[PDB]
Amino acid sequence: VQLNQYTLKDEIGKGSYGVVKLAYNENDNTYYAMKVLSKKPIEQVYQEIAILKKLDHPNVVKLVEVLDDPNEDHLYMVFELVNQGPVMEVPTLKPLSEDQARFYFQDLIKGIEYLHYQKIIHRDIKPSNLLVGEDGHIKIADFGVSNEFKGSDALLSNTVGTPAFMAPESLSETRKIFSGKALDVWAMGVTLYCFVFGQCPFMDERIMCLHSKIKSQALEFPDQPDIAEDLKDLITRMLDKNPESRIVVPEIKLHPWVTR
Numbered sequence: 001v002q003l004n005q006y007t008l009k010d011e012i013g014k015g016s017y018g019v020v021k022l023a024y025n026e027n028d029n030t031y032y033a034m035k036v037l038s039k040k041p042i043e044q045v046y047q048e049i050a051i052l053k054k055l056d057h058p059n060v061v062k063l064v065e066v067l068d069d070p071n072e073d074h075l076y077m078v079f080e081l082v083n084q085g086p087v088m089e090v091p092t093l094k095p096l097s098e099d100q101a102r103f104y105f106q107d108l109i110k111g112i113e114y115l116h117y118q119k120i121i122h123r124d125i126k127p128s129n130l131l132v133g134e135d136g137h138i139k140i141a142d143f144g145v146s147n148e149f150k151g152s153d154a155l156l157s158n159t160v161g162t163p164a165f166m167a168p169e170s171l172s173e174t175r176k177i178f179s180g181k182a183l184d185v186w187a188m189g190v191t192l193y194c195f196v197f198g199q200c201p202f203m204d205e206r207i208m209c210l211h212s213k214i215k216s217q218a219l220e221f222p223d224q225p226d227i228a229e230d231l232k233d234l235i236t237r238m239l240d241k242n243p244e245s246r247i248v249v250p251e252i253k254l255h256p257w258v259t260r
């Protein structure tokens with residue numbers, strides 16, 4: 001499969017958007033990541049593109065170009081390849097060590113801080129959207145449902161993202177307004193829990209029951225593996241069901257588990 005100067009190779013990532021394939025650029029003899037989307041709506045795609053064009057940070061993916069032809073049903077986004085792929089698969093029987101989780105979590109902090117400063121709410125933070133680059137550091141990927149806001153926070157009403165990572169205030173069935181930055185914090189808390197336990201803190205195959213656990217089930221840590229008390233404190237604060245008292249990113253940065 002040829003696409004101007006790009007030769008499409010095998011699939012390296014996959015999601016609701018479609019697929020991401022390895023692509024070989026014959027102009028510069030270099031590999032890129034090629035996200036392939038089918039027009040089946042389309043305007044959410046160009047919001048993702050508009051957001052990506054504004055982002056330039058070591059812990060965020062880098063959009064290189066967009067190949068859009070009105071005659072073809074497919075649309076192509078070329079990214080710089082983040083060669084080592086997702087930091088982990090969830091669930092897994094081999095979670096990260098605490099020192100490894102801290103290393104990656106420090107990257108996630110920096111990336112989220114940059115995004116929020118650039119007035120973007122990511123809305124789909126999870127380990128499979130955290131890609132490990134050449135130097136071993138994380139880049140945040142997949143802005144497919146991200147929001148841009150004006151002012152100091154987003155005031156939102158729509159429910160998007162990955163269900164196990166959705167914050168409880170986004171799960172009202174009355175279109176209540178909730179603020180955006182704390183949604184990303186919640187998902188960072190689910191992500192950090194996944195780092196060290198290998199599974200999500202709230203789980204159910206029945207979507208109704210999953211929503212109910214996110215909203216109403218108290219967080220429980222497994223007996224094994226035995227994690228540090230300050231890490232438990234940090235996760236507990238990020239998974240505060242009340243967004244008004246949930247820890248904020250400026251405080252996460254200072255948390256004693258993060259800084260030791």
Ligand SMILES: Nc1c(C(=O)O)cc(O)c2c1C(=O)c1ccccc1C2=O
Nearest residue numbers: 012013020033061079081082085141142
């Ligand atoms: N989903 C994305 C995106 C995006 O949707 O924003 C951007 C990317 O650069 C990448 C990916 C990947 O899934 C991926 C999977 C395996 C190796 C590299 C990559 C990658 O580099």
Ligand SMILES: [Cl-]
Nearest residue numbers: 090126127128
């Ligand atoms: Cl995941």
